[PDB]
Amino acid sequence: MLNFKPYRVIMSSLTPVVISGIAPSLDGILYEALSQAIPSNEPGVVLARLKEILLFNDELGVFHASSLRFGITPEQGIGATTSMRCDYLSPEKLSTAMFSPRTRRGLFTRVLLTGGPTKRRMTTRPAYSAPYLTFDFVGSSEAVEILLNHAHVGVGYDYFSAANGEFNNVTILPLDIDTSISNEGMALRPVPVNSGLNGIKGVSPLIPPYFVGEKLNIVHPAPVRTQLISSLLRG
């Protein structure tokens, strides 16, 4: 229970953002940030504290936290780059000082890195490299500023592991109209199908974390939305 005002948050993207099909919702970023702030992974308490910094739609069952929208400037636009993760079995990793390989003829059985359960996993994921990221939300500007600046949270699939979508220079500006849930009838974030908002059908939990809870039918915006930075700063 705190006075919530519609704010738009714009940050400078530093690394490619990997979208997990559904555009990353700022509510999820804030949920992760609070899970870091409150040393607890229990969804109930983290959600209860998230409602204190974000406006929650009871009738609609979501937080006022728009999905990711790529702020593109006339200098740099939305770019297609691959978030690229490779196992690097260095000579130090491949040495008897670190483990005991099975031996035959006194020779150490080399690890088959070309394939199998012990291969060099070349996991490549799509990622969108825009100069800025933007979200809208009806919440406390102080708490979200503190979280986004100091909590280890990024935009995309794995900021924790892959460090994808690192951001900085988080700038919050007030808005005039709440553009978190709806935008002239176009959902700007995951919402239930019965809400009457159009967009793209999908399956996902309405409330974060988006990897737990029954995946019920939802309507979500385009995964990759781009807007001019000048238009985003207009408010």
């Binding site: 400037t73 006339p74 200098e75 500006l173 930075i229 000048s230 700063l233």
Partner: protein, 104 residues
């Protein structure tokens, strides 16, 4: 020379930092000094609650509101926080890239 003096100090203190690193540090400290000095300059206006000021920065290097990636982005702190909306909606005397892109 302030860069040289600081580099010599750190070198004698044992810290291993290149001269250009000390130059960058001194440049950032000078930039913060400049931000404070121009904050003082702006503070010359709005001395009373009823005062109305039109602040006109004629410097090309002052960051445009839409150019959030300008090198001197910290200069936005010159504007008081309360008037940051007025910073966003400002008459630009010579805006760059002043067109309507289609890849929106």
């Amino acid at each position: 020379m302030k860069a040289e003096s600081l580099y010599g100090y750190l070198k004698e203190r044992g810290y291993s930092r290149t001269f250009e690193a000390v130059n960058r540090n001194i440049y950032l400290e000078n930039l913060r000094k400049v931000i404070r000095k121009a904050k003082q300059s702006v503070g010359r206006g709005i001395r009373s609650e009823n005062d109305t000021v039109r602040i006109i920065i004629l410097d090309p290097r002052f960051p445009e509101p839409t150019d959030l990636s300008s090198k001197h982005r910290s200069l936005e702190h010159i504007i008081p926080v309360r008037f940051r909306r007025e910073y966003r909606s400002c008459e630009i005397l010579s805006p760059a890239y002043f067109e309507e892109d289609i890849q929106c």
